[PDB]
């Protein structure tokens, strides 16, 4: 019995694919999950790519405390520790749901003058925002992520940092995850608490719902003032720094799953997939040697190409079982190398996106690289296609209600929080972002009729 | 205030070098510290080296929960969360002090047959073991580490795993940290709670005190039976699995500090140093372009050699500041590139171990690799020498008392926990380990006079 098809019950599909693809399981504590190897592998690949980009932009990792003094922030989202060291604590401690306060506290002492700027930090680690309904990679009390924090002398430098980091997320999304996104500003109601403004990249999942794939905020001098973070400038004048904050959690994995997955299971993007090419040898005692020798040789030839290949040499599972598992886990390509095919110097190259073809083993190494890129380009093409097919401009609240049932709704909004909150209360849909690049338009609020704001149509959609 | 020399007050020297090398700082919560970029970079290299070794030995990373059900274990060590989701928990959760239980729980349901073995897992993350007084990298409530957990079908396979890992640790210490260690067994009184036997690698710091650089435990089937972790063997019979456990925390960093640091600050082992060669460009307005062009050229030449080089062209600090900084931070080699020397195609290459010499930029790329290797060898050499000069066979408790005041004391012990405890109560010294490879000797306990156990002399010392 297969997975509950996407069109049947998308939600139940998602959970099942995660279990079957062995991406994760559920821990003994409600709301907490354990990321199994295969799943962790995806995370590690995302860490690596992001790290490079962070480093190339002059950022450095570090590590701040897990516990934060309540004074700095019981709110529901918080997991609070009231007892430690056997005794009850005078002031309870919050397990970090985010680290801006603690970092700010530390910057207050490290920063003295322009010589201590800019501060370009990043932290890979966990955080805790309490969750009851456990949904691997989408809803979990605890989750892993990357939270970058920076401090600058000028406002201009900070704002450039925000967009720089957002773009890095968009690039990871597009060039590495084959997930098309939309860059823009969150509305006042939707921004990060403490930030003057929040930028974001919004993606559209296969079930028509939007998902924020990453975020970068301009905190101005809000945290600087709160945590007394000032410096003496070259002009001998003492000023407040301007900080920024940017993060991307393993929710990005859920994005990968709900964007490219199908009724057969996962379909991982080549440039982030732990296994780009699995090799399943087909043989009998008589040809075991000659094939494994030809298989391993391929393995080595592929490695030499810099490809992430995996030789499923397991001598205890039918080639079908293997084939199924790798299909379930979304391995881009699969090479079935057997007796008869080998004899002509060829083998069969199965594509996860569908199709097969017997090619010459000697050509595989030179071919695969370019094929993987095609595979990636195709994933993106379809995703784009899907979005185009699920995006609609609306001028009436009746058309809007229809649109947010299928995907993205481009509506005019007055800009009033109460009006936007009403739209969510009635249709459950929210504002995703006020796109940076969008045809400039003026009109009237699709919900209250009053004159539109933002000078362009806002992206609306039901979101995760 | 300069660095309190080691001979004056080693402890104050340590706290001081850590602050001055900007390795870490104290967080807003007691017993908490923040690892600064430079310090974190050290940890990263350690992660990378250990990761490669773990992977080459078939281990895969995963990520289990931060929270552990209290019933799986308020002990002083624990940091308990009693409130979450805006209400008081009916069952207070414990912040993991170690991931033995949860992983066992998971294994209970993941393991069914011998097909599901061996289970070779590793996790990189944080744990919390409440601490009152805070001492960077040695005593902190929260600390980062790597904890390996494996499950095996046979007892032999488990024990081989145990030693395999300890050896990897030992290799890390020796070949990478240039820190000589001693592989042996912890006595019954000093083993890991829940383990059959605990192996370890003991190192001697420059203050004559011992320090555990890492441990590997044979848990037998204690956890397996406790969490009902069994499998159906090939012989159709159902049996318990045998599990191991091994860890190495950022305490290893503290080891690197107290093993090679001098009165001038840190001295980092080349193979683990974030920056192996730093290039500080000294120039004037009329010579900025020429100096920087050559400096960058050298940077690229060294990178090409696979060396970790850094070009310090910060505008927020002067040359004086920098040279002092990199000395404090312990960079193995320093390259002073100025206009005059550049005219003759030269620069000053200074060694952290002491030395200077104007050399032609063209020879540096080809010489440095070798020089670094020598640097490493030298560090190790001295470290070996230091230990030799601070290890002493003792046959009397009086001599014992003297030896433990300088370093290692090779004494005979009855093996009684009571006796061993008495020794510590009296001298504060502890058994570090009963070395695997040591000259076989029979005798009488240095403290109670009763016949000796372990068939060899037991390593004693005052430890961290
Ligand atoms: O939680 C957030 O959205 C910000 C950005 C990463 C760190 N904190
Ligand atoms: O704490 C210990 O010693 C074991 C080994 C690492 C995980 N737990
Ligand atoms: Zn309106
Ligand atoms: Zn005794």
mmCIF file with all atom_site columns, N, CA and C in Angstrom, chain A residues 25-26 32 34-37 44 61-63 65-66 76 78-86 106 109-110 114-115 117 126 130 142 316, chain B residues 25-26 28 32 34-37 40 44 61-63 65-66 76 78 80-86 106 109-110 115 126 130 142 316:
data_model
loop_
_atom_site.group_PDB
_atom_site.id
_atom_site.type_symbol
_atom_site.label_atom_id
_atom_site.label_alt_id
_atom_site.label_comp_id
_atom_site.label_asym_id
_atom_site.label_entity_id
_atom_site.label_seq_id
_atom_site.pdbx_PDB_ins_code
_atom_site.Cartn_x
_atom_site.Cartn_y
_atom_site.Cartn_z
_atom_site.occupancy
_atom_site.B_iso_or_equiv
_atom_site.pdbx_formal_charge
_atom_site.auth_seq_id
_atom_site.auth_comp_id
_atom_site.auth_asym_id
_atom_site.auth_atom_id
_atom_site.pdbx_PDB_model_num
ATOM 1   N N  . UNK A 1 25  ? 11.675 10.787 12.669 1.00 0.00 ? 25  UNK A N  1
ATOM 2   C CA . UNK A 1 25  ? 10.731 10.002 13.447 1.00 0.00 ? 25  UNK A CA 1
ATOM 3   C C  . UNK A 1 25  ? 10.283 10.915 14.577 1.00 0.00 ? 25  UNK A C  1
ATOM 4   N N  . UNK A 1 26  ? 9.444  10.420 15.474 1.00 0.00 ? 26  UNK A N  1
ATOM 5   C CA . UNK A 1 26  ? 8.982  11.261 16.573 1.00 0.00 ? 26  UNK A CA 1
ATOM 6   C C  . UNK A 1 26  ? 9.658  10.893 17.884 1.00 0.00 ? 26  UNK A C  1
ATOM 7   N N  . UNK A 1 32  ? 8.381  17.031 19.812 1.00 0.00 ? 32  UNK A N  1
ATOM 8   C CA . UNK A 1 32  ? 9.798  16.952 19.474 1.00 0.00 ? 32  UNK A CA 1
ATOM 9   C C  . UNK A 1 32  ? 10.084 15.803 18.497 1.00 0.00 ? 32  UNK A C  1
ATOM 10  N N  . UNK A 1 34  ? 13.146 13.527 15.924 1.00 0.00 ? 34  UNK A N  1
ATOM 11  C CA . UNK A 1 34  ? 14.536 13.126 15.806 1.00 0.00 ? 34  UNK A CA 1
ATOM 12  C C  . UNK A 1 34  ? 14.796 13.060 14.304 1.00 0.00 ? 34  UNK A C  1
ATOM 13  N N  . UNK A 1 35  ? 15.812 13.785 13.842 1.00 0.00 ? 35  UNK A N  1
ATOM 14  C CA . UNK A 1 35  ? 16.147 13.805 12.427 1.00 0.00 ? 35  UNK A CA 1
ATOM 15  C C  . UNK A 1 35  ? 17.070 12.638 12.117 1.00 0.00 ? 35  UNK A C  1
ATOM 16  N N  . UNK A 1 36  ? 16.549 11.691 11.343 1.00 0.00 ? 36  UNK A N  1
ATOM 17  C CA . UNK A 1 36  ? 17.313 10.511 10.964 1.00 0.00 ? 36  UNK A CA 1
ATOM 18  C C  . UNK A 1 36  ? 18.385 10.913 9.959  1.00 0.00 ? 36  UNK A C  1
ATOM 19  N N  . UNK A 1 37  ? 19.479 10.148 9.923  1.00 0.00 ? 37  UNK A N  1
ATOM 20  C CA . UNK A 1 37  ? 20.625 10.360 9.042  1.00 0.00 ? 37  UNK A CA 1
ATOM 21  C C  . UNK A 1 37  ? 20.302 10.955 7.681  1.00 0.00 ? 37  UNK A C  1
ATOM 22  N N  . UNK A 1 44  ? 22.785 19.179 6.543  1.00 0.00 ? 44  UNK A N  1
ATOM 23  C CA . UNK A 1 44  ? 24.212 19.442 6.396  1.00 0.00 ? 44  UNK A CA 1
ATOM 24  C C  . UNK A 1 44  ? 24.579 20.060 5.036  1.00 0.00 ? 44  UNK A C  1
ATOM 25  N N  . UNK A 1 61  ? 31.089 32.554 12.204 1.00 0.00 ? 61  UNK A N  1
ATOM 26  C CA . UNK A 1 61  ? 30.238 31.855 13.153 1.00 0.00 ? 61  UNK A CA 1
ATOM 27  C C  . UNK A 1 61  ? 30.759 32.073 14.565 1.00 0.00 ? 61  UNK A C  1
ATOM 28  N N  . UNK A 1 62  ? 29.913 31.769 15.541 1.00 0.00 ? 62  UNK A N  1
ATOM 29  C CA . UNK A 1 62  ? 30.236 31.892 16.956 1.00 0.00 ? 62  UNK A CA 1
ATOM 30  C C  . UNK A 1 62  ? 29.132 31.152 17.693 1.00 0.00 ? 62  UNK A C  1
ATOM 31  N N  . UNK A 1 63  ? 29.129 31.221 19.014 1.00 0.00 ? 63  UNK A N  1
ATOM 32  C CA . UNK A 1 63  ? 28.102 30.515 19.739 1.00 0.00 ? 63  UNK A CA 1
ATOM 33  C C  . UNK A 1 63  ? 27.694 31.194 21.038 1.00 0.00 ? 63  UNK A C  1
ATOM 34  N N  . UNK A 1 65  ? 24.859 31.537 24.389 1.00 0.00 ? 65  UNK A N  1
ATOM 35  C CA . UNK A 1 65  ? 24.102 30.689 25.318 1.00 0.00 ? 65  UNK A CA 1
ATOM 36  C C  . UNK A 1 65  ? 22.720 30.231 24.900 1.00 0.00 ? 65  UNK A C  1
ATOM 37  N N  . UNK A 1 66  ? 22.340 29.068 25.415 1.00 0.00 ? 66  UNK A N  1
ATOM 38  C CA . UNK A 1 66  ? 21.040 28.467 25.162 1.00 0.00 ? 66  UNK A CA 1
ATOM 39  C C  . UNK A 1 66  ? 20.004 29.154 26.038 1.00 0.00 ? 66  UNK A C  1
ATOM 40  N N  . UNK A 1 76  ? 3.558  31.910 25.911 1.00 0.00 ? 76  UNK A N  1
ATOM 41  C CA . UNK A 1 76  ? 3.270  30.560 25.420 1.00 0.00 ? 76  UNK A CA 1
ATOM 42  C C  . UNK A 1 76  ? 4.390  29.847 24.655 1.00 0.00 ? 76  UNK A C  1
ATOM 43  N N  . UNK A 1 78  ? 7.512  30.100 24.807 1.00 0.00 ? 78  UNK A N  1
ATOM 44  C CA . UNK A 1 78  ? 8.665  29.795 25.636 1.00 0.00 ? 78  UNK A CA 1
ATOM 45  C C  . UNK A 1 78  ? 8.658  28.537 26.501 1.00 0.00 ? 78  UNK A C  1
ATOM 46  N N  . UNK A 1 79  ? 9.785  27.825 26.485 1.00 0.00 ? 79  UNK A N  1
ATOM 47  C CA . UNK A 1 79  ? 9.995  26.648 27.326 1.00 0.00 ? 79  UNK A CA 1
ATOM 48  C C  . UNK A 1 79  ? 10.824 27.249 28.461 1.00 0.00 ? 79  UNK A C  1
ATOM 49  N N  . UNK A 1 80  ? 10.259 27.285 29.664 1.00 0.00 ? 80  UNK A N  1
ATOM 50  C CA . UNK A 1 80  ? 10.938 27.893 30.807 1.00 0.00 ? 80  UNK A CA 1
ATOM 51  C C  . UNK A 1 80  ? 11.542 26.942 31.835 1.00 0.00 ? 80  UNK A C  1
ATOM 52  N N  . UNK A 1 81  ? 12.798 27.203 32.190 1.00 0.00 ? 81  UNK A N  1
ATOM 53  C CA . UNK A 1 81  ? 13.496 26.411 33.197 1.00 0.00 ? 81  UNK A CA 1
ATOM 54  C C  . UNK A 1 81  ? 13.481 27.224 34.506 1.00 0.00 ? 81  UNK A C  1
ATOM 55  N N  . UNK A 1 82  ? 12.805 26.678 35.514 1.00 0.00 ? 82  UNK A N  1
ATOM 56  C CA . UNK A 1 82  ? 12.654 27.322 36.816 1.00 0.00 ? 82  UNK A CA 1
ATOM 57  C C  . UNK A 1 82  ? 13.490 26.654 37.903 1.00 0.00 ? 82  UNK A C  1
ATOM 58  N N  . UNK A 1 83  ? 13.971 25.451 37.601 1.00 0.00 ? 83  UNK A N  1
ATOM 59  C CA . UNK A 1 83  ? 14.778 24.676 38.531 1.00 0.00 ? 83  UNK A CA 1
ATOM 60  C C  . UNK A 1 83  ? 16.070 24.192 37.885 1.00 0.00 ? 83  UNK A C  1
ATOM 61  N N  . UNK A 1 84  ? 17.194 24.503 38.517 1.00 0.00 ? 84  UNK A N  1
ATOM 62  C CA . UNK A 1 84  ? 18.493 24.079 38.006 1.00 0.00 ? 84  UNK A CA 1
ATOM 63  C C  . UNK A 1 84  ? 19.450 23.932 39.180 1.00 0.00 ? 84  UNK A C  1
ATOM 64  N N  . UNK A 1 85  ? 20.412 23.024 39.063 1.00 0.00 ? 85  UNK A N  1
ATOM 65  C CA . UNK A 1 85  ? 21.354 22.832 40.148 1.00 0.00 ? 85  UNK A CA 1
ATOM 66  C C  . UNK A 1 85  ? 20.655 22.376 41.413 1.00 0.00 ? 85  UNK A C  1
ATOM 67  N N  . UNK A 1 86  ? 19.582 21.607 41.241 1.00 0.00 ? 86  UNK A N  1
ATOM 68  C CA . UNK A 1 86  ? 18.828 21.097 42.374 1.00 0.00 ? 86  UNK A CA 1
ATOM 69  C C  . UNK A 1 86  ? 17.937 22.115 43.062 1.00 0.00 ? 86  UNK A C  1
ATOM 70  N N  . UNK A 1 106 ? 25.785 41.168 24.843 1.00 0.00 ? 106 UNK A N  1
ATOM 71  C CA . UNK A 1 106 ? 27.219 40.986 24.676 1.00 0.00 ? 106 UNK A CA 1
ATOM 72  C C  . UNK A 1 106 ? 27.845 42.102 23.833 1.00 0.00 ? 106 UNK A C  1
ATOM 73  N N  . UNK A 1 109 ? 29.020 45.313 25.537 1.00 0.00 ? 109 UNK A N  1
ATOM 74  C CA . UNK A 1 109 ? 30.349 45.380 26.132 1.00 0.00 ? 109 UNK A CA 1
ATOM 75  C C  . UNK A 1 109 ? 31.502 45.256 25.135 1.00 0.00 ? 109 UNK A C  1
ATOM 76  N N  . UNK A 1 110 ? 31.295 44.528 24.047 1.00 0.00 ? 110 UNK A N  1
ATOM 77  C CA . UNK A 1 110 ? 32.339 44.381 23.053 1.00 0.00 ? 110 UNK A CA 1
ATOM 78  C C  . UNK A 1 110 ? 32.501 45.657 22.243 1.00 0.00 ? 110 UNK A C  1
ATOM 79  N N  . UNK A 1 114 ? 34.014 52.719 16.387 1.00 0.00 ? 114 UNK A N  1
ATOM 80  C CA . UNK A 1 114 ? 33.911 52.289 15.008 1.00 0.00 ? 114 UNK A CA 1
ATOM 81  C C  . UNK A 1 114 ? 34.911 51.181 14.711 1.00 0.00 ? 114 UNK A C  1
ATOM 82  N N  . UNK A 1 115 ? 35.914 51.043 15.568 1.00 0.00 ? 115 UNK A N  1
ATOM 83  C CA . UNK A 1 115 ? 36.930 50.015 15.359 1.00 0.00 ? 115 UNK A CA 1
ATOM 84  C C  . UNK A 1 115 ? 36.375 48.617 15.591 1.00 0.00 ? 115 UNK A C  1
ATOM 85  N N  . UNK A 1 117 ? 33.473 47.721 14.500 1.00 0.00 ? 117 UNK A N  1
ATOM 86  C CA . UNK A 1 117 ? 32.433 47.566 13.495 1.00 0.00 ? 117 UNK A CA 1
ATOM 87  C C  . UNK A 1 117 ? 32.986 47.351 12.082 1.00 0.00 ? 117 UNK A C  1
ATOM 88  N N  . UNK A 1 126 ? 20.172 25.300 17.665 1.00 0.00 ? 126 UNK A N  1
ATOM 89  C CA . UNK A 1 126 ? 18.750 25.095 17.899 1.00 0.00 ? 126 UNK A CA 1
ATOM 90  C C  . UNK A 1 126 ? 18.118 26.250 18.664 1.00 0.00 ? 126 UNK A C  1
ATOM 91  N N  . UNK A 1 130 ? 7.619  26.717 21.470 1.00 0.00 ? 130 UNK A N  1
ATOM 92  C CA . UNK A 1 130 ? 6.663  25.658 21.780 1.00 0.00 ? 130 UNK A CA 1
ATOM 93  C C  . UNK A 1 130 ? 5.599  25.374 20.738 1.00 0.00 ? 130 UNK A C  1
ATOM 94  N N  . UNK A 1 142 ? 11.174 22.213 19.180 1.00 0.00 ? 142 UNK A N  1
ATOM 95  C CA . UNK A 1 142 ? 12.576 22.486 18.941 1.00 0.00 ? 142 UNK A CA 1
ATOM 96  C C  . UNK A 1 142 ? 12.876 22.288 17.466 1.00 0.00 ? 142 UNK A C  1
ATOM 97  N N  . UNK A 1 316 ? 21.548 -8.251 0.269  1.00 0.00 ? 316 UNK A N  1
ATOM 98  C CA . UNK A 1 316 ? 20.445 -8.819 1.043  1.00 0.00 ? 316 UNK A CA 1
ATOM 99  C C  . UNK A 1 316 ? 19.086 -8.202 0.722  1.00 0.00 ? 316 UNK A C  1
ATOM 100 N N  . UNK B 2 25  ? 33.782 34.680 26.271 1.00 0.00 ? 25  UNK B N  1
ATOM 101 C CA . UNK B 2 25  ? 33.400 35.700 27.235 1.00 0.00 ? 25  UNK B CA 1
ATOM 102 C C  . UNK B 2 25  ? 32.256 35.152 28.074 1.00 0.00 ? 25  UNK B C  1
ATOM 103 N N  . UNK B 2 26  ? 31.924 35.838 29.155 1.00 0.00 ? 26  UNK B N  1
ATOM 104 C CA . UNK B 2 26  ? 30.861 35.368 30.028 1.00 0.00 ? 26  UNK B CA 1
ATOM 105 C C  . UNK B 2 26  ? 29.486 35.881 29.620 1.00 0.00 ? 26  UNK B C  1
ATOM 106 N N  . UNK B 2 28  ? 25.228 36.524 30.152 1.00 0.00 ? 28  UNK B N  1
ATOM 107 C CA . UNK B 2 28  ? 24.414 37.086 31.236 1.00 0.00 ? 28  UNK B CA 1
ATOM 108 C C  . UNK B 2 28  ? 23.970 36.109 32.335 1.00 0.00 ? 28  UNK B C  1
ATOM 109 N N  . UNK B 2 32  ? 27.648 30.342 32.408 1.00 0.00 ? 32  UNK B N  1
ATOM 110 C CA . UNK B 2 32  ? 27.433 30.403 30.977 1.00 0.00 ? 32  UNK B CA 1
ATOM 111 C C  . UNK B 2 32  ? 28.504 31.229 30.275 1.00 0.00 ? 32  UNK B C  1
ATOM 112 N N  . UNK B 2 34  ? 30.093 32.520 26.124 1.00 0.00 ? 34  UNK B N  1
ATOM 113 C CA . UNK B 2 34  ? 29.851 32.657 24.700 1.00 0.00 ? 34  UNK B CA 1
ATOM 114 C C  . UNK B 2 34  ? 31.194 32.415 24.052 1.00 0.00 ? 34  UNK B C  1
ATOM 115 N N  . UNK B 2 35  ? 31.205 31.617 22.991 1.00 0.00 ? 35  UNK B N  1
ATOM 116 C CA . UNK B 2 35  ? 32.435 31.332 22.284 1.00 0.00 ? 35  UNK B CA 1
ATOM 117 C C  . UNK B 2 35  ? 32.506 32.305 21.125 1.00 0.00 ? 35  UNK B C  1
ATOM 118 N N  . UNK B 2 36  ? 33.519 33.169 21.150 1.00 0.00 ? 36  UNK B N  1
ATOM 119 C CA . UNK B 2 36  ? 33.699 34.177 20.114 1.00 0.00 ? 36  UNK B CA 1
ATOM 120 C C  . UNK B 2 36  ? 34.211 33.573 18.812 1.00 0.00 ? 36  UNK B C  1
ATOM 121 N N  . UNK B 2 37  ? 34.032 34.292 17.689 1.00 0.00 ? 37  UNK B N  1
ATOM 122 C CA . UNK B 2 37  ? 34.474 33.821 16.374 1.00 0.00 ? 37  UNK B CA 1
ATOM 123 C C  . UNK B 2 37  ? 35.776 33.048 16.399 1.00 0.00 ? 37  UNK B C  1
ATOM 124 N N  . UNK B 2 40  ? 35.410 29.910 18.241 1.00 0.00 ? 40  UNK B N  1
ATOM 125 C CA . UNK B 2 40  ? 34.510 28.995 17.560 1.00 0.00 ? 40  UNK B CA 1
ATOM 126 C C  . UNK B 2 40  ? 35.197 28.360 16.358 1.00 0.00 ? 40  UNK B C  1
ATOM 127 N N  . UNK B 2 44  ? 35.327 24.530 15.083 1.00 0.00 ? 44  UNK B N  1
ATOM 128 C CA . UNK B 2 44  ? 34.941 24.060 13.756 1.00 0.00 ? 44  UNK B CA 1
ATOM 129 C C  . UNK B 2 44  ? 35.985 23.112 13.171 1.00 0.00 ? 44  UNK B C  1
ATOM 130 N N  . UNK B 2 61  ? 25.824 11.197 11.012 1.00 0.00 ? 61  UNK B N  1
ATOM 131 C CA . UNK B 2 61  ? 25.273 12.163 11.964 1.00 0.00 ? 61  UNK B CA 1
ATOM 132 C C  . UNK B 2 61  ? 23.749 12.144 11.929 1.00 0.00 ? 61  UNK B C  1
ATOM 133 N N  . UNK B 2 62  ? 23.142 12.463 13.067 1.00 0.00 ? 62  UNK B N  1
ATOM 134 C CA . UNK B 2 62  ? 21.693 12.530 13.211 1.00 0.00 ? 62  UNK B CA 1
ATOM 135 C C  . UNK B 2 62  ? 21.462 13.639 14.218 1.00 0.00 ? 62  UNK B C  1
ATOM 136 N N  . UNK B 2 63  ? 20.224 13.823 14.647 1.00 0.00 ? 63  UNK B N  1
ATOM 137 C CA . UNK B 2 63  ? 19.963 14.837 15.650 1.00 0.00 ? 63  UNK B CA 1
ATOM 138 C C  . UNK B 2 63  ? 18.755 14.465 16.482 1.00 0.00 ? 63  UNK B C  1
ATOM 139 N N  . UNK B 2 65  ? 16.382 14.847 20.213 1.00 0.00 ? 65  UNK B N  1
ATOM 140 C CA . UNK B 2 65  ? 15.842 15.930 21.040 1.00 0.00 ? 65  UNK B CA 1
ATOM 141 C C  . UNK B 2 65  ? 16.704 16.519 22.154 1.00 0.00 ? 65  UNK B C  1
ATOM 142 N N  . UNK B 2 66  ? 16.454 17.795 22.416 1.00 0.00 ? 66  UNK B N  1
ATOM 143 C CA . UNK B 2 66  ? 17.130 18.544 23.456 1.00 0.00 ? 66  UNK B CA 1
ATOM 144 C C  . UNK B 2 66  ? 16.494 18.144 24.782 1.00 0.00 ? 66  UNK B C  1
ATOM 145 N N  . UNK B 2 76  ? 21.069 17.772 40.747 1.00 0.00 ? 76  UNK B N  1
ATOM 146 C CA . UNK B 2 76  ? 21.738 19.070 40.609 1.00 0.00 ? 76  UNK B CA 1
ATOM 147 C C  . UNK B 2 76  ? 22.227 19.330 39.189 1.00 0.00 ? 76  UNK B C  1
ATOM 148 N N  . UNK B 2 78  ? 21.017 18.553 36.381 1.00 0.00 ? 78  UNK B N  1
ATOM 149 C CA . UNK B 2 78  ? 19.909 18.923 35.501 1.00 0.00 ? 78  UNK B CA 1
ATOM 150 C C  . UNK B 2 78  ? 19.360 20.345 35.504 1.00 0.00 ? 78  UNK B C  1
ATOM 151 N N  . UNK B 2 80  ? 16.017 21.772 34.590 1.00 0.00 ? 80  UNK B N  1
ATOM 152 C CA . UNK B 2 80  ? 14.644 21.361 34.312 1.00 0.00 ? 80  UNK B CA 1
ATOM 153 C C  . UNK B 2 80  ? 13.670 22.442 33.851 1.00 0.00 ? 80  UNK B C  1
ATOM 154 N N  . UNK B 2 81  ? 12.906 22.134 32.804 1.00 0.00 ? 81  UNK B N  1
ATOM 155 C CA . UNK B 2 81  ? 11.891 23.062 32.307 1.00 0.00 ? 81  UNK B CA 1
ATOM 156 C C  . UNK B 2 81  ? 10.560 22.588 32.906 1.00 0.00 ? 81  UNK B C  1
ATOM 157 N N  . UNK B 2 82  ? 9.879  23.494 33.598 1.00 0.00 ? 82  UNK B N  1
ATOM 158 C CA . UNK B 2 82  ? 8.620  23.177 34.267 1.00 0.00 ? 82  UNK B CA 1
ATOM 159 C C  . UNK B 2 82  ? 7.421  23.863 33.615 1.00 0.00 ? 82  UNK B C  1
ATOM 160 N N  . UNK B 2 83  ? 7.706  24.855 32.775 1.00 0.00 ? 83  UNK B N  1
ATOM 161 C CA . UNK B 2 83  ? 6.662  25.600 32.087 1.00 0.00 ? 83  UNK B CA 1
ATOM 162 C C  . UNK B 2 83  ? 6.936  25.751 30.598 1.00 0.00 ? 83  UNK B C  1
ATOM 163 N N  . UNK B 2 84  ? 5.896  25.537 29.807 1.00 0.00 ? 84  UNK B N  1
ATOM 164 C CA . UNK B 2 84  ? 5.972  25.664 28.361 1.00 0.00 ? 84  UNK B CA 1
ATOM 165 C C  . UNK B 2 84  ? 4.544  25.824 27.864 1.00 0.00 ? 84  UNK B C  1
ATOM 166 N N  . UNK B 2 85  ? 4.388  26.334 26.647 1.00 0.00 ? 85  UNK B N  1
ATOM 167 C CA . UNK B 2 85  ? 3.057  26.510 26.093 1.00 0.00 ? 85  UNK B CA 1
ATOM 168 C C  . UNK B 2 85  ? 2.139  27.363 26.946 1.00 0.00 ? 85  UNK B C  1
ATOM 169 N N  . UNK B 2 86  ? 2.724  28.178 27.818 1.00 0.00 ? 86  UNK B N  1
ATOM 170 C CA . UNK B 2 86  ? 1.933  29.057 28.660 1.00 0.00 ? 86  UNK B CA 1
ATOM 171 C C  . UNK B 2 86  ? 1.160  28.389 29.779 1.00 0.00 ? 86  UNK B C  1
ATOM 172 N N  . UNK B 2 106 ? 14.542 5.505  20.959 1.00 0.00 ? 106 UNK B N  1
ATOM 173 C CA . UNK B 2 106 ? 14.395 5.408  19.511 1.00 0.00 ? 106 UNK B CA 1
ATOM 174 C C  . UNK B 2 106 ? 14.865 4.053  18.982 1.00 0.00 ? 106 UNK B C  1
ATOM 175 N N  . UNK B 2 109 ? 12.485 1.043  19.086 1.00 0.00 ? 109 UNK B N  1
ATOM 176 C CA . UNK B 2 109 ? 11.536 0.858  18.007 1.00 0.00 ? 109 UNK B CA 1
ATOM 177 C C  . UNK B 2 109 ? 12.126 0.782  16.600 1.00 0.00 ? 109 UNK B C  1
ATOM 178 N N  . UNK B 2 110 ? 13.364 1.226  16.414 1.00 0.00 ? 110 UNK B N  1
ATOM 179 C CA . UNK B 2 110 ? 13.970 1.136  15.089 1.00 0.00 ? 110 UNK B CA 1
ATOM 180 C C  . UNK B 2 110 ? 14.625 -0.223 14.867 1.00 0.00 ? 110 UNK B C  1
ATOM 181 N N  . UNK B 2 115 ? 19.374 -7.194 10.845 1.00 0.00 ? 115 UNK B N  1
ATOM 182 C CA . UNK B 2 115 ? 19.462 -6.420 9.617  1.00 0.00 ? 115 UNK B CA 1
ATOM 183 C C  . UNK B 2 115 ? 19.646 -4.959 9.991  1.00 0.00 ? 115 UNK B C  1
ATOM 184 N N  . UNK B 2 126 ? 24.750 20.460 21.743 1.00 0.00 ? 126 UNK B N  1
ATOM 185 C CA . UNK B 2 126 ? 25.001 20.901 23.103 1.00 0.00 ? 126 UNK B CA 1
ATOM 186 C C  . UNK B 2 126 ? 24.262 20.071 24.131 1.00 0.00 ? 126 UNK B C  1
ATOM 187 N N  . UNK B 2 130 ? 24.584 21.429 34.766 1.00 0.00 ? 130 UNK B N  1
ATOM 188 C CA . UNK B 2 130 ? 24.677 22.586 35.643 1.00 0.00 ? 130 UNK B CA 1
ATOM 189 C C  . UNK B 2 130 ? 25.974 22.738 36.416 1.00 0.00 ? 130 UNK B C  1
ATOM 190 N N  . UNK B 2 142 ? 26.476 24.953 30.145 1.00 0.00 ? 142 UNK B N  1
ATOM 191 C CA . UNK B 2 142 ? 26.233 24.484 28.794 1.00 0.00 ? 142 UNK B CA 1
ATOM 192 C C  . UNK B 2 142 ? 27.561 24.372 28.060 1.00 0.00 ? 142 UNK B C  1
ATOM 193 N N  . UNK B 2 316 ? 40.348 49.444 10.859 1.00 0.00 ? 316 UNK B N  1
ATOM 194 C CA . UNK B 2 316 ? 40.016 49.773 12.236 1.00 0.00 ? 316 UNK B CA 1
ATOM 195 C C  . UNK B 2 316 ? 41.112 49.463 13.251 1.00 0.00 ? 316 UNK B C  1
#
